[PDB]
Amino acid sequence: FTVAGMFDGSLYKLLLRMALPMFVGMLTQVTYAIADIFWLSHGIIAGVGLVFPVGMGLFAIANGIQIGMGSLLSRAIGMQRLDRAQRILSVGIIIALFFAIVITVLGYVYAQPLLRSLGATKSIIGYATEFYYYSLLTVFSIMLIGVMMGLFQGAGKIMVIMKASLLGALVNIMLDPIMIFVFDFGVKGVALASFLAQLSMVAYFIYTLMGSWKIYREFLSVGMAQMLMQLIIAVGIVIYNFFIVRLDVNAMAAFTLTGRIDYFIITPMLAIATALLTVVGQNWGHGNVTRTLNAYWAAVALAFSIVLVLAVMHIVLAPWMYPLFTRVVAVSDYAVLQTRIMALALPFVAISLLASEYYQAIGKPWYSVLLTLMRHVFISVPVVYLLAIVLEMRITGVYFGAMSGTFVAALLAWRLLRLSPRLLRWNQEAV
Ligand SMILES: CCCCCCCC/C=C/CCCCCCCC(=O)OC[C@H](O)CO
Ligand SMILES: C[As](C)(=O)[O-]
């Protein structure tokens, strides 16, 4: 339970030692697709891709369960009640269960209409429906992993998470071949290999692990706020796609190229965020508010610094890199212009995004959502409209408008994260 350096140590050492294992775990996740497509190399079943969004709303909900778990457990530990702690796992599991039932049941009955809003059946439907159904069979297990992730992240034991992750990636590496060759299962088999990978992780956790509406409310409010924030981010990407497409179809193709890469650059900040939840949550429970504030700015210093480097790499690399990805030069031009304009905003995203983690850690999701709304909606939409339409800038106007929310939100974070009477009162009420 202790997690050395938590209450008295160097915050940089503390956050890094926690965030680095978490980052390794995140790299394992990528290997799945690499191994999958490597073995898929040996037009009908390929509507598996149609069902891809469903897998992502499952990780999204699992993620909300994780932070609810992480947030609540880490405050209990810091308060030194391994008391509410065993309660929390219980309530964590029960919440995960009902979420799986509601999702499988509404999944099933509304299956037909839901699938319509994804893809067209002139060729792929029966393939689509089967995979949708197999996806439903994975829900409880995915939710279970959220609980477990939330359990070991709350206790600050990330090595168990990093080792679970590695075991999962090895399993998928070995099984993918066996499903193709021994069992003759095709694409289904690589999917099933990925899934037995996830269960072996689940197994690893439980084996390691061997040896009152108020509390549903506390868990549900943080956890569901996390889901609401995924949503807002997804919606902001929709409104962005809407504008890009109606202006120039090539800019929409450019974004399709930049997206995975823009996402990797941001991952080191997601790793630090996870570490910060534990440190804020536990120091908050222990009553040390100053240290939680120092913890946030230690995290911003790490995250900003790393992402700025990855961002600058992207910008200078883009002119040489993107032409290799496409022969249409309007598409590689748009991708280069987008990166050049928006890339430096990325490290600034750390300021408001870590601010969101802090409020989740201390049980105040309202300000988590406030900062996410401020970043992806309240500023961006009206400013993009202003710059891309009224002022006659077009795609260049989208790029500038869209990143203006990141700056305002960074301003907000900076103002809110500091000693205040209310913040100190909040900690009095907590302990
Ligand atoms: C969780 C991550 C949140 C970060 C989001 C802030 C984006 C600012 C810079 C990103 C440039 C790289 C991607 C370029 C296209 C991003 C589209 C986008 O983020 O749009 C923001 C706003 O919602 C418009 O409507
Ligand atoms: C109304 As209050 C407890 O957020 O100051």
Side-chain angles (χ1 to χ4, degrees):
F1 272 133
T2 49
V3 189
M6 180 60 68
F7 309 105
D8 61 356
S10 168
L11 286 169
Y12 295 112
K13 295 315 168 250
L14 176 59
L15 287 168
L16 274 183
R17 97 199 253 180
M18 292 177 72
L20 277 194
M22 186 55 73
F23 185 73
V24 167
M26 285 173 207
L27 287 187
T28 73
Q29 278 160 2
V30 175
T31 70
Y32 282 67
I34 296 171
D36 277 352
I37 180 49
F38 171 55
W39 288 120
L40 272 164
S41 75
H42 287 352
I44 316 184
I45 300 193
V48 79
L50 181 160
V51 89
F52 182 77
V54 160
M56 280 199 303
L58 294 190
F59 279 158
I61 295 168
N63 195 244
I65 290 182
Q66 182 197 345
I67 293 296
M69 194 66 172
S71 179
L72 227 34
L73 174 64
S74 83
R75 315 216 276 304
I77 297 177
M79 262 178 308
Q80 290 201 307
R81 325 207 203 265
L82 315 169
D83 177 19
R84 271 169 55 99
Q86 212 222 332
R87 281 187 191 160
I88 277 162
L89 162 54
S90 294
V91 156
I93 286 166
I94 288 181
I95 280 162
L97 180 51
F98 273 75
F99 251 96
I101 298 175
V102 180
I103 293 178
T104 44
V105 180
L106 270 65
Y108 185 52
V109 306
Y110 279 85
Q112 167 59 196
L114 303 180
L115 276 167
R116 282 197 292 280
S117 36
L118 303 172
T121 77
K122 156 67 185 185
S123 208
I124 55 176
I125 182 181
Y127 285 108
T129 304
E130 186 179 10
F131 279 110
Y132 171 82
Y133 278 156
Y134 294 152
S135 293
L136 294 183
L137 292 183
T138 74
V139 173
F140 184 49
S141 333
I142 306 310
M143 302 296 111
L144 254 188
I145 291 181
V147 174
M148 299 297 75
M149 293 273 303
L151 186 39
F152 285 93
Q153 162 186 33
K157 309 295 162 188
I158 312 309
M159 292 295 308
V160 177
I161 293 179
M162 186 200 56
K163 286 174 207 166
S165 275
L166 284 171
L167 172 57
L170 285 175
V171 171
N172 176 250
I173 281 156
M174 292 168 195
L175 286 182
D176 265 357
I178 306 173
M179 304 293 165
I180 307 164
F181 294 144
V182 184
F183 292 93
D184 204 332
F185 279 165
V187 167
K188 286 184 302 187
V190 296
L192 172 68
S194 279
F195 183 55
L196 295 170
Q198 275 148 194
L199 281 181
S200 34
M201 292 189 41
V202 173
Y204 192 98
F205 281 149
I206 298 183
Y207 286 148
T208 289
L209 194 39
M210 285 166 161
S212 161
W213 176 253
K214 79 155 150 66
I215 196 178
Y216 283 92
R217 178 164 167 189
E218 177 59 76
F219 191 121
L220 271 185
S221 60
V222 164
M224 267 178 187
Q226 184 71 357
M227 302 174 198
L228 195 58
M229 285 180 275
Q230 320 278 54
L231 197 43
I232 295 168
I233 291 172
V235 173
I237 293 180
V238 169
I239 293 165
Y240 186 80
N241 280 1
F242 182 71
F243 273 102
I244 298 296
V245 125
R246 175 157 100 86
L247 284 179
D248 184 315
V249 175
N250 298 296
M252 180 64 241
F255 185 33
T256 300
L257 291 177
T258 71
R260 285 178 219 171
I261 298 181
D262 283 319
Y263 180 80
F264 158 70
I265 289 169
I266 294 169
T267 44
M269 147 209 311
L270 296 182
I272 303 175
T274 65
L276 178 68
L277 186 101
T278 318
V279 171
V280 173
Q282 280 201 6
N283 283 266
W284 174 265
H286 198 285
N288 192 336
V289 177
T290 271
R291 185 162 174 85
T292 70
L293 282 192
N294 298 317
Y296 165 83
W297 293 106
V300 167
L302 294 170
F304 193 101
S305 281
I306 313 189
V307 169
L308 174 70
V309 173
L310 292 183
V312 173
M313 290 188 198
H314 194 193
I315 292 191
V316 293
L317 266 174
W320 297 298
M321 180 172 55
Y322 282 110
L324 311 176
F325 287 174
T326 168
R327 285 192 188 85
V328 187
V329 319
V331 166
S332 92
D333 277 355
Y334 269 138
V336 170
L337 181 63
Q338 179 190 263
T339 299
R340 290 209 172 121
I341 296 189
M342 302 176 75
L344 287 173
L346 279 165
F348 283 92
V349 178
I351 295 149
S352 74
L353 187 133
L354 292 173
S356 281
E357 206 69 355
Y358 180 94
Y359 287 111
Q360 293 283 62
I362 63 156
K364 302 285 175 172
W366 163 277
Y367 299 91
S368 293
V369 176
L370 174 58
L371 286 164
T372 304
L373 285 175
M374 193 73 11
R375 198 177 54 249
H376 293 95
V377 175
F378 285 143
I379 302 286
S380 289
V381 164
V383 162
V384 158
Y385 201 94
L386 177 55
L387 291 186
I389 312 302
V390 176
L391 287 306
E392 283 169 18
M393 316 176 48
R394 307 191 117 237
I395 290 291
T396 284
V398 181
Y399 299 160
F400 277 109
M403 74 177 181
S404 70
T406 283
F407 290 107
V408 184
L411 253 180
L412 188 49
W414 180 29
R415 297 192 175 180
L416 292 176
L417 268 290
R418 55 167 94 257
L419 285 168
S420 73
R422 178 202 256 178
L423 183 69
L424 290 190
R425 199 219 322 144
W426 279 352
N427 199 248
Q428 257 173 13
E429 306 165 336
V431 315

